[PDB]
Design an enzyme around this catalytic site. Structure first.
Site, PDB file in Angstrom:
ATOM      1  N   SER A  78       0.775  -1.297   0.000  1.00 27.26           N
ATOM      2  CA  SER A  78       0.000   0.000   0.000  1.00 27.26           C
ATOM      3  C   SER A  78       0.759   1.268   0.000  1.00 27.26           C
ATOM      4  O   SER A  78       0.109   2.275   0.063  1.00 27.26           O
ATOM      5  CB  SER A  78      -0.990   0.086   1.165  1.00 27.26           C
ATOM      6  OG  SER A  78      -0.300  -0.021   2.376  1.00 27.26           O
ATOM      7  N   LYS A 100      -6.131   4.520   8.189  1.00 26.17           N
ATOM      8  CA  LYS A 100      -5.156   5.420   7.527  1.00 26.17           C
ATOM      9  C   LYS A 100      -5.638   6.853   7.525  1.00 26.17           C
ATOM     10  O   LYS A 100      -4.932   7.720   7.955  1.00 26.17           O
ATOM     11  CB  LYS A 100      -4.874   4.949   6.146  1.00 26.17           C
ATOM     12  CG  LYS A 100      -3.949   3.641   6.152  1.00 26.17           C
ATOM     13  CD  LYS A 100      -4.090   2.952   4.811  1.00 26.17           C
ATOM     14  CE  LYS A 100      -3.053   1.873   4.670  1.00 26.17           C
ATOM     15  NZ  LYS A 100      -3.338   0.919   3.629  1.00 26.17           N
TER      16      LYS A 100
END
Ligand SMILES: *[B]([O])([O])[C]([C][C]([C])[C])[N]C(=O)[C]([C][C]([C])[C])[N]C(=O)[C]([C][C]([C])[C])[N]C(=O)O[C]C1=[C][C]=[C][C]=[C]1
Ligand SMILES: *[B]([O])([O])[C]([C][C]([C])[C])[N]C(=O)[C]([C][C]([C])[C])[N]C(=O)[C]([C][C]([C])[C])[N]C(=O)O[C]C1=[C][C]=[C][C]=[C]1
Lengths: 581, 133, 133, 128
Positions: C49, C92
């Site tokens: 990611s 996140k």
């Protein structure tokens, strides 16, 4: 070539589906010629033997029914008599004569030695372990739990003394004159292998005691029995490594995993199912016999695991209300797929969501839907996006998944093989003027095998030539150094796996799979896939060569220029000029 | 011969010769003979059964072929696959940079098979690549 | 290189290099060495990611292009430079929001993420309000 | 539902009344309590307690042996036909240890798998 619906259909036509089946039971060992004969030799010869084959074939039930038909001399009276007050012996008499108690038991020499107790006021009984009426059918003893006490019998303690009469028999004793069947695994697991060799090699048979205070010496005695061991190929290796094994167990009786797919064995499976108590209809036999073909991924063979077949049949029966019908079998199969479909239903949702990026229509350069299987039962197949990128380079082919430690050895071997082909096939520039990188775009997990070599190489060739490839056709096949395409495995799962993806996203009409011609006889596709092929909604191409696969993908021929080959050349030349200006 | 007779076998000259030759064969030595009396006896006990109690040249040749039969499953699978084109092999014709090498598969009784071997050459810097290594 | 990255982290780095090398070809091979670091990290980092953050950073260093530091980035990339879904998205985003709020919101802060993860956004109220404001 | 799968708890026990024993000193085990009905066990527990093989032998072969102490005289007690449906419960992972055992799938044919998530619908809000 294109494989027509007619080439693909492999199922058995059904006539009078509901008709009850009536059939006599096949003998033990049908379609198992080799194992039957090995076992026959072992019986005529007195040899020990082992029965080897994969799990759920029914090796045990076949062996036991087969031994029930055997006939031999009625088993001797079998016993322990004392030699001392600390010693016991194993004896054999001619049968039934031990209801007795010079004398007229002259075979019992030593028990001298029950001889002078009142020359002191010095103040016992002979024991029987076995006796019997007939040697038909013989002793057959099957101890699946091979502990010492269960094999060799036991000594119990009557308060703290003991004597012959407190000695309990063990399987080995029960099997005298007849058969002892044991599991290879169990003797391993229970660490009884050496003690059991000593019983065979040396006559050594010792009833178990507790960690005191006085034991009994008990003599060896000659062992009368034929022992058969049963287990898998693998169950045996632990044993074979022991030079004693092959010495003791000379006759290998091996089951084949599969049978020819013939009328006689369909018919044999029918009677076998009936003897098991099933209410079977002709339609219910045909679907089961075809599932067996399917289980073996062999149009011409049928899977031999009677127990698997029975287990599925017991499920179909429930769904058919006690009756085993074509539908109940097709439904019991679809229900098993349903019971294990969670992981796939999650995958399809993700794909529909764009969480897994896949394309199934359109075209793109250097991309291809390869096909994988995920390695847990029941081994679903799925498409996996594969990308190939090319740049001016020094003859480097980069397998990204390998390099990152995800590729296995066979995966690596395929990548090297294809580079062998590329380097050798295109030589005008000397070494190849490109670096080509290959990735299985959403893979996080180990991938292993050579069945993606064909997808990898067409992807490479497309990136080199800048050649747009059809994304509605998936690819599976291995390649060799000459670019021939080679058979691979799990083919039904692969194809049916792209069909699910396509159907979940909505069929274009033009979707399909390219696969090796070499695997035509492995196609035993499920109905829905076959129908879709019959309807022009799905297509199967079979090839012999990588370049054949490429012409289908890039919708063009290698030559008759404007061919694909000159464009591949033109790509390589351009990459060559960029690598020096 | 005498050793087998003392063991109780009913032995014929043909049954001795085939056994003594199998011993040579077991040692892969024309001029030596394998010394494992117990292996020889065990094979002889199989031949005897097949000869009805008599140890004859045929019963020994048959007891050998039966041992090969009892362990032939893996080979019969291989041959089917080859016939099927599942294992690609060539046995007639010619080709560049290809050869049938011969291997043995490492489990008793150590069957041998051809294994296709390919060699591909290209402009390079004195590199010989063993792919399997 | 220092042994902190995992296999998937490594796989992302290779994927992006596949993109760069292939996308920019006028000079033949790429005329640059590009070094990437997660500046205060002492611990194993694993996953793909960060591929999108890595590649825009590369492109900025190549082009000398100043990038906004009030927007954080998460997303995976493929070889064609498409951006691919990643995981733990709520954590996140809410994690950059805490940093920004602790340092005092500019008004212009945010996160860039894959379109592919729209249905995963189940953001806590305070983050949603701040977006509304 | 025996969540702690020890041998004594599954198969029952033999106690010793001073040092003799007879039928009447034999205590029942879960397997006995479940006859005609349901026995539910934890996959983890049979693993942890190393009782997996002994429990196959109870299902495969009728083998059900009440536990003794390290003497002096035991009782032979015959197999008998087992009447019960057993359900095992655990995680995907709890199962792998088991599946690796070809005996498992043979004995435990029906997978009943829960989904981790539900559609977000009015009916399930209402159900919750
Ligand atoms: B082919 O040889 O058939 C093929 C070539 C691959 C696609 C390049 N190999 C496979 O399909 C193998 C099958 C075999 C190892 C059983 N599959 C794998 O190695 C898979 C590949 C992924 C993309 C599904 N890896 C895998 O099963 O391992 C990890 C894992 C297993 C089970 C569940 C989750 C992860
Ligand atoms: B030669 O030295 O005789 C020869 C050279 C090879 C062909 C390049 N070596 C062998 O034939 C060896 C024999 C020895 C190791 C017993 N064979 C192998 O290493 C084989 C080769 C394959 C192609 C059959 N490998 C092998 O036996 O290992 C794996 C395995 C063993 C048994 C069953 C299945 C797999």
């Amino acid at each position: 070539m294109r494989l027509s619906y007619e080439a693909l259909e492999w199922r058995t036509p059904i006539e009078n589906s509901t008709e009850p089946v009536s059939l006599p039971p096949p003998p033990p060992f049908f379609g198992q010629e080799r194992a039957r004969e090995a076992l026959e030799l072992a019986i005529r010869g007195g040899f020990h033997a082992y029965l080897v084959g994969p799990p759920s074939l029914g090796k045990h039930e076949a062996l036991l029914a087969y031994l029930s038909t055997q006939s031999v001399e009625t088993p001797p009276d079998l016993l322990y008599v004392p030699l001392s007050e600390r010693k016991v012996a194993v004896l054999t008499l001619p049968s039934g004569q031990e209801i007795h108690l010079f004398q007229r038991f002259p075979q019992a020499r030593a028990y001298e030695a029950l001889r002078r107790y009142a020359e002191t006021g010095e103040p016992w009984r002979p024991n029987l372990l076995t006796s019997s009426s007939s040697g038909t059918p013989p002793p057959i003893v099957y101890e699946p739990y091979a502990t010492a006490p269960r094999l060799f019998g036991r000594l119990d303690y009557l308060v703290w003394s003991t004597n012959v009469s407190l000695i309990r028999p063990g399987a080995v004793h029960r099997a005298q004159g007849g058969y002892l069947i044991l599991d290879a695994l169990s003797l391993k697991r229970e660490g009884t292998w050496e003690a059991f060799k000593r019983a065979l090699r040396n006559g050594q048979v010792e009833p178990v005691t507790e960690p005191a205070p006085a034991g009994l010496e008990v003599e060896p005695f000659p062992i009368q029995m034929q022992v058969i061991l049963v287990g898998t190929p693998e169950a045996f290796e632990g044993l074979e490594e022991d030079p004693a094994f092959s010495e003791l167990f000379r006759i290998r009786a091996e089951f084949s995993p599969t049978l020819p797919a013939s009328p006689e064995n369909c018919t044999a499976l029918g009677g076998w199912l009936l003897a098991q108590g099933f209410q079977l209809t002709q339609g219910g036999l045909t679907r089961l016999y075809d599932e067996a073909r399917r289980m073996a991924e062999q149009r011409d063979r049928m899977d031999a695991r009677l127990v698997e077949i029975r287990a599925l049949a017991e499920e179909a029966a429930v769904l058919g209300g006690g009756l085993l019908t074509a539908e109940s079998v097709e439904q019991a199969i679809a229900a098993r797929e349903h019971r294990s479909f969670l992981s796939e239903e999650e995958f399809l949702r993700a794909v529909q969501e764009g969480v897994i990026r896949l394309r199934t229509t359109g075209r793109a350069v250097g991309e291809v839907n390869s096909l994988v299987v995920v390695e847990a039962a029941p081994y679903w197949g799925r498409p996996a996006r594969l990308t190939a990128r090319a740049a001016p380079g020094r003859d480097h082919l980069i397998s990204i998944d390998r390099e990152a430690g995800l590729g296995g050895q066979i995966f690596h071997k395929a990548v090297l093989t294809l580079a062998g082909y590329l380097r050798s096939r295109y030589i005008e520039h000397g070494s190849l003027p490109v670096t080509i990188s290959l990735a299985f775009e959403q893979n996080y997990v180990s991938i292993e095998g050579d069945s993606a070599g064909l997808a990898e190489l067409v992807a490479a060739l497309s990136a080199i030539g800048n050649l747009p490839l059809r994304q509605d056709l998936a690819v599976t096949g291995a390649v060799d150094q000459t670019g021939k395409v080679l058979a691979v495995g799990a083919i039904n799962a692969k194809v049916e796996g792209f069909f699910r993806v396509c159907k979940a996203l909505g069929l274009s009409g033009t979707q399909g799979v390219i696969l090796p011609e070499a695997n035509l006889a492995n196609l035993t596709l499920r109905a829905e896939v076959l129908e879709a092929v019959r309807a022009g909604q799905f297509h199967i191409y079979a090839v012999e060569t990588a370049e054949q696969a490429l012409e289908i993908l890039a919708g063009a021929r290698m030559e008759g220029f404007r061919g694909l080959q000159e464009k591949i050349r033109a790509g390589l030349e351009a990459f060559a000029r960029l690598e020096e200006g």
